Amino acid sequence: MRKDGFDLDLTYVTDHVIAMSFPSSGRQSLFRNPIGEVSRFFKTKHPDKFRIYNLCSERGYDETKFDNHVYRVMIDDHNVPTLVDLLKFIDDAKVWMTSDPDHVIAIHSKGGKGRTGTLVSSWLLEDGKFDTAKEALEYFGSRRTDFEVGDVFQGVETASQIRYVGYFEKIKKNYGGQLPPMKKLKVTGVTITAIQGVGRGNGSDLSMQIVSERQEVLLCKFAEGYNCALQYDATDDCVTCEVKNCPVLAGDIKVRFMSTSKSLPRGYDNCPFYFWFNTSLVEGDHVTLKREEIDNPHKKKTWKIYRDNFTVKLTFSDAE
Ligand SMILES: [Cl-]
Ligand SMILES: [Cl-]
Ligand SMILES: [Cl-]
């Protein structure tokens, strides 16, 4: 049985904003579901000071029980909260932080990085500490790593996480802190540039899944023409796919690309590359994401595969 133990990692982002995590378990530990007991300690030994936010996956949410002093947010590892849930979090934090100058918010997630960073950086924007998502993200990265070099990827883990902090910035600045109006869209096309070196280099290994919040709503398989029609353009080093039968989409959308190619590595989320967007913040008839704006190609270790001009564009139709 060698070594067990409780390793509570606590990082003061500001004097009243804490990021907490438990980096050490491990495997079979006596300390199962530590949040309940950390909460119990706070309400006993430091009453009416700390409010804990527990950020956990769909599966991990089931293991939790309601707590008066704990606010739960459902977010999958290497993913983002719904924009609605992000705004609800900000509202709850605002109420807690403003009611008493001594009040502290403590944000917890398993890895103490991507999910925590998304919410902490959004909070820093709400409290006016920074004017831009980039500044907030870099600052949190610097606090959690104790390292000076400003890197947004030290603050969060994925490009969608960076996007969602940006979404909050836009909501605060341009929408009066309110959720933007619903926008209904259908995906009618996908275009991928710099396809050479990516799987088979011609799109024939690829499939695309569209997920609405947590439910698959469309699957396209490119080579086969399953809900689609693939065209490979060698002269422009790109693939374009007509997307067929897309249902009406609204709100938070996840797009995942899968491959039958052994040579194309999976990153996070059990796939080669993926991204999140919100339909309400789509401008025009498309969204185009560059290499470092896509989840997985954002990592330098994949740059021999996803080259400088690798981009993914979704083309939309207006659904009333
Ligand atoms: Cl419950
Ligand atoms: Cl792999
Ligand atoms: Cl239509």
Side-chain angles (χ1 to χ4, degrees), residues 12-18 49 97 102-104 139 143:
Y12 279 87
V13 179
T14 73
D15 285 346
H16 298 87
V17 176
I18 291 173
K49 196 192 208 300
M97 292 286 276
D102 290 329
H103 279 172
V104 173
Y139 177 73
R143 299 297 292 180

Side-chain angles (χ1 to χ4, degrees), residues 20-21 58 63 82 93 112 144 156 165 171 179 184 186-187 219-220 278 304:
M20 51 178 200
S21 187
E58 197 183 338
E63 293 181 47
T82 67
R144 62 161 295 278
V156 295
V165 180
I171 285 164
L179 191 74
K184 297 177 179 176
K186 293 176 176 189
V187 173
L219 179 60
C220 305
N278 189 292
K304 66 178 182 170

